[PDB]
């Protein structure tokens, strides 16, 4: 009865950590193209001489988002 309710509250709280990880990885991926972290003279110059560096950083965050999305789906 009430144990069934506190069980699904415990099966649901197991999703809250992977759900936060997915949101965090999604936001960090999105912020790669707009964050003030990259709005410096250093990154503009770095992005001018070797734009591959920023693309590499984005590729890593995409791979991390994909891993985070799977682990969240594995808690369903």
């Amino acid at each position: 009865m009430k144990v069934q309710e506190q069980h699904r509250q415990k099966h649901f709280e197991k999703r809250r950590m992977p759900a936060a990880n997915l949101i965090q990885a999604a936001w960090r991926l999105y912020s790669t193209d707009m964050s003030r972290a990259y709005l410096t003279a250093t990154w503009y110059k770095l992005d001018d001489i070797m734009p591959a560096v920023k693309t590499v950083i984005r590729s890593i965050r995409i791979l991390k988002f994909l891993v985070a999305k799977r682990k969240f789906k594995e808690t369903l």
Binding site: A19, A26, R36, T55, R58, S59, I60, K73
Partner: protein
């Protein structure tokens, strides 16, 4: 739908990983570049990243797989649905809204916790009116665009 130079840019990034030029990215080359930037992934984390895009099964990323991954980013149907499902886990009313305070709370206390400056940049990217509520459905539309 990718321009010829847009492909050349992704090829340049792929070549940074693929240092020896054999057309594949292993855990060695993926982790070497990550750690050159100051990151410290574990070997298991590198295997999980590669397995997300390795459609052959040999434990590598080739350029076609890399190109598709870079083109899709988060713009797919499955990403929009699962990110929305993640926000729902922190939606008490089931109304598609979450208070900016509760969003700040979960981001800085669960999982790979966001820094204070990170979550501040996230809250500024969403819009707040009235009771401090953010419409996270329009927030995931912004991220997956």
């Amino acid at each position: 739908q990718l321009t010829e130079e847009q492909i050349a840019e992704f090829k340049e990034a792929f070549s940074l990983f693929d240092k020896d030029g054999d057309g594949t990215i292993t855990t060695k080359e993926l982790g070497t570049v990550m750690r050159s930037l100051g990151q410290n992934p574990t070997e298991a984390e590198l295997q999980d990243m590669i397995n997300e895009v390795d459609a052959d099964g040999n434990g590598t990323i080739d350029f076609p797989e890399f190109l598709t991954m870079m083109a899709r980013k988060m713009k797919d149907t499955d990403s929009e649905e699962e990110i929305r499902e993640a926000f729902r886990v922190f939606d008490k009313d089931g109304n598609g809204y979450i208070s900016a305070a509760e969003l700040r709370h979960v981001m800085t206390n669960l999982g790979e916790k966001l820094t204070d400056e990170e979550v501040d940049e996230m809250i500024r990217e969403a819009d707040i009116d009235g009771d401090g509520q953010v419409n996270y459905e329009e927030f995931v539309q912004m991220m997956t665009a």
